[PDB]
Structures are given as structure tokens and as C-alpha cells.
Amino acid sequence: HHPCCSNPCQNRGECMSTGFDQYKCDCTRTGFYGENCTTPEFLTRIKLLLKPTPNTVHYILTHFKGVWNIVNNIPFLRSLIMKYVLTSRPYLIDSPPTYNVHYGYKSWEAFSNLSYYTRALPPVADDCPTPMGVKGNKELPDSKEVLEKVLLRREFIPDPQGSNMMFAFFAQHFTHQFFKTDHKRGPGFTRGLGHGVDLNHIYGETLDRQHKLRLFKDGKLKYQVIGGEVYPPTVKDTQVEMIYPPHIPENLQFAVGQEVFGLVPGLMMYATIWLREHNRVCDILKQEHPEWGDEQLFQTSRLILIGETIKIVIEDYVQHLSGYHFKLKFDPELLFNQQFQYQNRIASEFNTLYHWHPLLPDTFNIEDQEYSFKQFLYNNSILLEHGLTQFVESFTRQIAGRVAGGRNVPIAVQAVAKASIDQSREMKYQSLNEYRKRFSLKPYTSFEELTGEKEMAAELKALYSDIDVMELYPALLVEKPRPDAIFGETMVELGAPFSLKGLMGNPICSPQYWKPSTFGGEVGFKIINTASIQSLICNNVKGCPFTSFNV
Amino acid sequence: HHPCCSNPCQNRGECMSTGFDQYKCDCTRTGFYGENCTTPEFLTRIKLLLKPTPNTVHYILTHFKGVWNIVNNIPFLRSLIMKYVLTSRPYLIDSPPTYNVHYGYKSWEAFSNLSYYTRALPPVADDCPTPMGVKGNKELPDSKEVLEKVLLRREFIPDPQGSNMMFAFFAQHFTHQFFKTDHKRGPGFTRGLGHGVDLNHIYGETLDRQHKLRLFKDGKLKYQVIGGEVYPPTVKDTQVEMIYPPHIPENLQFAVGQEVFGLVPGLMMYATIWLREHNRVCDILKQEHPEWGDEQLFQTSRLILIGETIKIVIEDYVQHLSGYHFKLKFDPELLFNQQFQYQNRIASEFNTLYHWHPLLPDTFNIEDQEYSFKQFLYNNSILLEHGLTQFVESFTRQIAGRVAGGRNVPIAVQAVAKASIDQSREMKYQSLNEYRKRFSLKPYTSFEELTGEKEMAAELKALYSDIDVMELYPALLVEKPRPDAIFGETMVELGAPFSLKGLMGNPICSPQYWKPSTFGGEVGFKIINTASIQSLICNNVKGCPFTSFNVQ
């Protein structure tokens, strides 16, 4: 079998077979040398001697609120800290991208083919004796057993950080512009060739789709007015293909950038809000530039909204889920004097860790109703009955479930959770501890160390037998959470590099793009830099309901 | 009309309409300010004074050989000098890219659509009064007149820098992997979606085409053996689409990565050489890695050949045409501590300046024969009859034509040269002086300053009237060349940023790629770092003939 099955190379060392039963570790620029890249250089010794654990770092950022309140009001200090954040995090990401599900070695096919999800770790070889390499049994435990014993939800466990349905649906809406698995090819393939924040879930992936959605007047998108309320156009009107069950009436088949947003009313809420925002920005640009044609108005509006999105994702979305008292800032200028690649490739592992199924509630409470999953799915008539204002008000005050901590995946979506396990195995993912070492984290020595308790830990120990073969995805959901937090250590320390790299790697953050002229002047520029989740709702939802990602 | 037609914004400032008859300049990080970004900041004002002209720098680089001889042998100095080159040159290129033929403002369409050539300067607005904006006559001079009066060859003018046919055919073969104009859409579009050195002219643009060219054994490419010599396979054998006249014999319809390389036996020479080189590297890798499969042997060989290409293009190709006494070096590490974007988008202007038609001779001299254009086109039997060895010996000895200086475009390719002017107007290029300012060059204040002579300058004066509306492409071919050189200032100062950007902007030059493991260990890595145009011919051509980009 393949000589590199045991994953012998440490500290980001590259493994290569040198014969049928021998290997060689490439230790170039790792700071280590030796057969297995384990002997540290002198400077490396000092660095590891001063490098604080992510847990101690998280402690500092989540305590001393008064001190942080002082720091946040010092523009120099605020910029200084945020600069370090935006540099150290994406450093853990290979850019240009390297491996994918078919290539455990670097190749031109892996690099050039945008249909692939890239891979932060190469897949386990096909001829390996055990599914994880050489450790563990001949087969992984039944995904159904892992599912039912430590993942499925008994009592609903609310998020202690206070995340609401606005957060949960925003996450689902935002991430599904770059998480679009090409299931015709397999789980390791994507339909989102933009590999980032291009807002294709609003404008469409292809140019044909975009043009069917556009009004070609004033740079706006097509829309319908129902009861004085602007909503997305229909499939019949645009001939834009959408995924709907055959029993869905023609009038309720809204056409949006993403082909699946019709299936969940929460997604359609944001789709309507963002469509309204695009046309709102067109109005603003038109009286700034009465000479501009339809095409430039549309294109400039898209760039502003892309900037709006990144602005909101960092200073509201990421600000909330991090729990830091420090005030995050979206400022591309911080990276102008640093080494940084303004490009991005979506990693399969980024996708897998973002399957936040425990976030979902048991019922969706709107106004005075409690819709089940069966009642909620495909049901856009719910959106029309209550309206966006009621949706925002209701979802702002409905709490979400805890992601980590185990046993909080709703039974309604158990098939999806089982698929995340099965497809991780299908794509030959490496073990949890391999991904922890990949991201500068200390491996777990026991299951009790992973869960932070005894009951679930014993369940897993009887399933996997070895902590070194524990799978990544079910680990993220049963991981011991940070104190009163929604996530555990692995989730944050893996997701943060992936996220920030995708956000800052956008070309509009490059210095040749980050100009007022890119966004039609200072006015359009200020739209991006003053954007927020509250303003997004206040501008586009009747009555300006209060909203946030907490309470 | 559009209030930015006159191009009022200077020093990389960005123009924007604010009304029907008002504009605004964005002077962000230009080093300048004021309405037109013309008032220099104090630091900028100092930099301008202390900055030596490109001609001054060219003099130093092409003189004091005794000093460069010392510099080239002091690894710290050589690297330091090379480190400056690799940092100063690509800095003039927008990366991530910006404009294209359809967008004179930044948009997500222009950034994301890889079917476009990108643009260093935005196109002239459609509603502008004159073709170049506001200056000049209502119409540009007749393209045919410009062609015949100052471009077409009267008598053959040899390149004083000594470039041979090996150089000219390498230029055409190499650059036609990223210059693949999609004429089904327009001249502003490309079929090379890789936008750089990916060797699709060897392996094919699509996976479907690649798999028809592959042997699927030992990682090798399919081939045929004719008279003991290894040649590319046929169209019939691989079902690979190639551009051939119907009357071409089946066995002579060679199938390679690029559809148009059957057009001329000079291109098929290099295609055959690179085909053999790939299968040679396969043999070496199969020896080092008996455990490896066909797919890994193929992919790793490709990365190595990409490395070889960038290595040769820098240290032999660019080294030759530069004329520098300084010894250029291909070392990705020089940028590891620098700010550099490992990405590239092929500019339409890079394409236009690379139309080095004057390089072509009146006849193609192989052995004792002198084939004409009509006899040479689509005639691979010449390649077979003489063999690669005689091809290399003959082409190493035959001189090439001077590109700059005017009147050296062969009549046989006059239609191509004319098309370069017509298409540049369709794509609405800005003037020569606009592209000179864009790349930190002083604008030509007269046609005589441009040509360095009087006869062509006078003709150009009667045709264009204004020097500020002189076109880019014909100016590159009539420009006063550097002393005994092949190019003029504008060709180098525009070409060097573009070239070096695409070369170092390759992913294999990135820290995560630049490792022995990437190329199958130390052995594959050594193939790259010792590659040369001589080694390429020596390993893959029978008899190992001496070869060079210079006749000497």
C-alpha cells in the first residue's frame, strides 16, 4: 500500500513515495528538519516557546471588557490589532491552492480546474489498509450509530451566545453563494466557479441567468409588486430555472440568483431584502450619475453590494459569533503593506465545517405561529402572509441552537447530517487530529478531552476505539464548547482562516479596486463603509424594524 | 459626449463622469493630486528628479561588460540586481486585472470573465468625437496607407542584435499558448483561459483534448515513429482537431496541443521537441518512482516542463533580446520576501506588441534549400525530409529581421499586419503617447523624435497630423531602435512588465509549489533549474547540434 498512509510528515511537511515501501518528507520552509520534519530549528524553538494557545488568546479577547472598551476608541490601537488578525489567520491557507479530492499531490489539473473544491489536507490514498490511513479498524463505525448516539437532538439546546434566526438564515444565505456542491459530479465538486463573495446567489452564476433577472433599465433587477411590496419575479416571467417541488404554484415560484433559495422562506426573505438593496443603490447612483447608462449602474451597484456584504459579514456577523469584546473593522488598507494574495479557492473542509445543522430550531416561530419543518419548507406563502417586517421582528427574537456540545441536530434533518459524515468518508477526509495539527493545534489525547465530559466520550470510544481516527465533522458538533460559547476550539481555529481569506481575498479589497471611483464616487463608497445588518433592514424593510444577530 | 474622452487624468489617476459635461479624477495612491492629478506631492517630486530614464538604465545594462562580469559572479549582487528587476517591472500591471474591451470602468464582469483579454488602458468611449478621444482628425489614416508607406518591407533588414530563426520560432511557439485570439467573438477575446504559461499548446486547452493526446502509459503523450524518428501522432489516430488544408496527407497531419501549429514547420519543430522532452522526463520519473501511476507521472512531467519553459524563457530568451551584459536569473525565492500577486491576466496590448512579423525572413533556408512562404506553409514534409537535426543547424545560422526601425514587414504577411491595425481600432485602443505615459515614459513631442529619421516621420505627419494620436502598433515597428538593437524604448518598457508578470505569476513560483516534492523530488527539480535552450535540443534532437538564439 501507499507509503504515506500513516501521515508520517509533521509540521506542514510534504510526503512523497520514494519506492513501493519508502517515503521522503519535504521539510522546506517549515522551520523543522529531520526524517519526519520533527526536529525544530533554533528560531522555531523560540517561536513555539512564546506562542500562546488559542484558548488563552480567546480568554483575553472575551474578558477585560472595560479595557477593550478603551482600546476600541483608539483608532491607532484598533487598526494595529485588526491588522494582526487579518494577516496571521489566512497565512494557514495555501494560496495558490494545492490539493483536491482527486489529487493528493500538486498538479496543474488541481490548480486550474475550478470545478473542484480545493483541499486543506490531501485525501487518504485508496489502497490504505484502514480508512484513516493505518490506525483504527478495517472500517469506520456506522454513520447512523455515530449520528444517533452523539449528534441527534433530545432536548433543544439554545445557543448561550444568543444567536437568533436572523443569524442562522444569514449564515445559510451568505455561505450558499460559494457552497454549491455539484452533485452531478460528486461531493468534492462545486458549481460556484467564482470561489468567493461574488454575490452570484443574487445575480446568478452565468451571464444568461443574470440577464434574465435584469430589467435593463436604470441598472435594476426585475421584480414584482404584491400588495405594495417589492418581491422577486417569477419563474414564468423570467424563465429562470428554480428548484421547486411540482406542486408549488406558479405565482409562488420566485426567481433569484440561487436555484435553491425557493425551498426555505428564511432564505427568500434575505433574497428579497438584497434585491431591494440593489435597486435602492441604483436609485442613489442615478442621481449621482444621471449620465450613466443601465449597464454601468448595474455593475457599480454589484460592486457596492459585494462591499456591503463583506462589511456586514465582518463587523456584524463575525463580530457576533466570535464573542470578542474587541471591535472588528473592515479596512483593506491594513493589508496594503503586508504580503497577501488577493485570490481564493473554496476548500471542501471549509464547506464541511459550516454544516451548522444544530443551529436550526424545532419549529419556526413567526408572529403567533409555530411552523414545523414540513410546514415551513417550500412554503413561500408564509412570507407573503406575515410580510418581511414580521419575519425580521420574529426572527430577531427567536434563539438558535448550540452548534458544538453534542446532541443538538434536529431529527428533521438527520438525513443531511448523516450525509455530511458519509460524504466526508467518500471524499476520504483525514482524521480530526490531522486537521488540528494542520492548523497549529495540539491533538486530542482522549475522547473525554474532546467532549469535555464522560457520557458522550464513552459512546465515541466504543465506536472509534482510537482518538487518532475520530472523524472531523462529528467532532466539531460534539466538541467541548468555549465557556458559554457556540463553538469549540477546532471550529474557530479552522473556520477563521478560511473565512477571512475568502473575505479579504476579494479583488475589491485590492488597492487598485479600493477607490471611490470604483464605486461611482465618494457617495457609493460611503455606502459600503457605513453598511450594517441593521441598516440593510432599515433601508429595505417597511417600518425599519430593529434587528441584530443576538437576542 | 463622455467628459473623459480627452483623458484629463494623469499619473495613473482614474477618470469618472460626474455629469453630462463634468469629470472627476481619482488620485488615490498616485503620488499626485489636483483636478487632473498633476500636482506632485513632496516625496513624489523628489522621486521624479532622482529617477533615471529607461534609456539611461539601458545604457548601463548594455555597457561596462567588465563590471557586469564581476557582478554576474557575485551571487549576492546578481540576486540583488535580479530581485529589483522582478519587483520594479510587474508593478505597472493591474493585478487583480481591471478593464477590458467592453468595460472602461471596473466591474465584476470584467474581472470574472476569463474569455476577455484584459486591458492596461481602458478603451476610448464610443461617443467620442475623434477615434483617439478629442485630438486629431475625425478619421484615422487609411490602414493600408500606413502599412505600405512605413511598415511593408522594401529590402530585408537583418536584426543587428543577431537574433536567428530559433529565436523567432521560439517566440511564436511559446507566446501562442496565451495569445489564442477567439475570432468567433472578437479580437478582445481569448481561448487561453489559463492566461499564462500552462503549456496548453503542448497538452491541450481542455481535458477532453488532453486525453486524446495522452498515451495513458508511463505518463507519456501519444506519438508516432517515422523513419526511426519520433513525431507527434496524426489527427486520424487521436481524433484531435487541427487546422489543415484538405489536401494534406493523413500521415502529415500532426496533432498537438495547439490547433494552429501545423501551419508552419518551425512550430512543429518545437512541438516535436517538447513532445520528446515530456516523454523523456516521464522515463526519468518512472525510474525514480517505479511505484507511481500513469496519472502522477503525467502531471508531474507537466509541472517540470512548465518549470523548464519559464527557466529557458528568462535565462536564454529574454536574456538574448534584452541585450544586457547582466546575467538574468530564474529564482522564485527572490520574491518570497516581497509583495507579489501570483496571478496573471493576458492583456490585449501585450498581444498587439508581440506581433513581431518583421522577424520573418524572405525565405526559409533549410540545408541547401530556400523555401518561400507558399512552399513553407502547412508543409510538414519539409520537417520529415530534412529532420529536426538539420532544422536546428539551419535555423541557428539563419538571421532574423529587425522588428523596430520601420519598413521590415514581409509582404507575405501584410494582411496580418494590417489586421493588427484594424483590430486595434475595433478594440478602440488609446494612442501611443497615452500608453507611454501609462508606463512612465515621456510622450513623443514629434514624429521625428519617434522614428529618429525624416522620411517615415514626414509620411506619418501627413497621415496622422498630430503626434498625440499616433497609433500604438505601427509606432512600435517604426520606432527608433536602441543602438544596434531589435526594439525601441516603448517595446521594452511595455513588454518587460507584461512578460515578467506572466512568468513569475505562475503558481509553481509560489512558496507552496516551489519545492522538490512538487516535481517528484530532487531529480525533477534539477531538470528545471539546469534547463536551457541548448539542453532542450541536446536531449531531444539526434546528434545534439549546437543551438542558440543568436547567430554569432
Ligand code: COH
Ligand atoms: C449555516 C447555517 C445553515 C442553516 C441555517 C441550514 C439550514 C438547513 C435547512 C432548513 C432551514 C435545511 C432543510 C437544510 C438541509 C441541507 N443543508 Co443546511 N443549513 C446550514 C448550513 C449548510 C451548509 C453551509 C451546507 C453546504 C451546501 C453544499 O452545497 O454542500 C448545507 C447543506 C445542506 C443540504 C445539502 C446536502 C449536503 O450537501 O450535505 C441540505 C439538504 N447546509 N439545511
Ligand code: COH
Ligand atoms: C511573435 C512572433 C510571431 C511570428 C514569428 C509570427 C509569424 C506568423 C506567420 C509565419 C509563417 C504566419 C502565417 C502568421 C499569421 C498569423 N499571425 Co502571427 N506571428 C507572431 C506573433 C503573432 C501574435 C502575438 C498574434 C496574435 C494572436 C491573436 O490572437 O491575435 C499573431 C496573429 C496571427 C494570426 C491570427 C489571425 C489573425 O490575426 O489574422 C495569423 C493567421 N501572430 N504569423
Ligand SMILES: *[C@@H]1O[C@H](CO)[C@@H](O[C@@H]2O[C@H](CO)[C@@H](O[C@@H]3O[C@H](CO)[C@@H](O)[C@H](O)[C@@H]3O)[C@H](O)[C@H]2NC(C)=O)[C@H](O)[C@H]1NC(C)=O
Ligand atoms: C464572457 O463575455 C462574453 C461576451 O459578453 C459572453 O458571451 C456572450 O454570451 C451571451 C449569453 O451567454 C450571448 O448573448 C446572446 O443571448 C441570447 C439569448 O436571448 C441569444 O439568443 C444570442 O444568440 C446570444 O447567445 C452573447 O452573444 C455572447 N457573446 C459572445 C461574444 O460570445 C460569455 O458568456 C461571458 N462568459 C461567461 C462565463 O459568462
Ligand SMILES: *[C@@H]1O[C@H](CO)[C@@H](O[C@@H]2O[C@H](CO)[C@@H](O)[C@H](O)[C@H]2NC(C)=O)[C@H](O)[C@H]1NC(C)=O
Ligand atoms: C474538471 O474536472 C472534471 C472532472 O474530472 C471534468 O469533467 C469531466 O470532463 C470529461 C471530458 O469533458 C468527461 O468525460 C467527464 O465525464 C467529466 N467528469 C465529470 C465528473 O464531470 C472537467 O472537464 C474539468 N474541467 C475542465 C475545464 O477541463
Ligand SMILES: CCCCCCCCO[C@@H]1O[C@H](CO)[C@@H](O)[C@H](O)[C@H]1O
Ligand atoms: C542598473 C540596474 C537597473 C535595474 C535593472 C532592471 C531595469 C529596471 O528598469 C526600471 O523599471 C521601472 C518599472 O518598470 C521603470 O519605472 C524605470 O523607468 C526603469 O528604469
Ligand SMILES: CCCCCCCCO[C@@H]1O[C@H](CO)[C@@H](O)[C@H](O)[C@H]1O
Ligand atoms: C514593397 C512594398 C512597397 C509598397 C510602397 C507603396 C506605397 C509607397 O510608399 C512610398 O515608398 C517610397 C519608397 O519606399 C518611400 O520613399 C515613401 O516614403 C513612401 O511613401
Ligand SMILES: C[C@H](C(=O)O)c1ccc(-c2ccccc2)c(F)c1
Ligand atoms: C475574528 C475571529 C478571529 O479569530 O479572527 C473569528 C472567529 C471566528 C470566525 C469564524 C467564522 C466562520 C466560521 C468559523 C469561524 C472567524 F472568521 C473569525
Ligand SMILES: C[C@H](C(=O)O)c1ccc(-c2ccccc2)c(F)c1
Ligand atoms: C529583463 C528585461 C527588463 O528590462 O526587465 C526585459 C524583460 C522582458 C522583455 C521583453 C519585452 C517584450 C517582449 C518580451 C520580453 C525585455 F525586452 C526586457
Ligand SMILES: *[C@@H]1O[C@H](CO)[C@@H](O)[C@H](O)[C@H]1NC(C)=O
Ligand atoms: C518517523 O516516522 C516513522 C513512522 O511514523 C517512524 O517509524 C520513525 O521512527 C520516525 N523517525 C524519526 C526520526 O522520528
Ligand SMILES: *[C@@H]1O[C@H](CO)[C@@H](O)[C@H](O)[C@H]1NC(C)=O
Ligand atoms: C403553508 O403555509 C400556510 C400558512 O401561510 C399554511 O396554511 C399551509 O398549510 C402550508 N402548506 C403546507 C404544505 O404546509
Ligand SMILES: *[C@@H]1O[C@H](CO)[C@@H](O)[C@H](O)[C@H]1NC(C)=O
Ligand atoms: C485639467 O485638464 C483640462 C483638460 O485636460 C484642462 O482644461 C484644465 O485646465 C486642467 N486643470 C488643471 C488644474 O490643470
Ligand SMILES: *[C@@H]1O[C@H](CO)[C@@H](O)[C@H](O)[C@H]1NC(C)=O
Ligand atoms: C513541400 O515541401 C517539399 C519539400 O519537402 C516540396 O517538394 C513540395 O513542393 C512542397 N509542397 C508545396 C505545395 O509547395
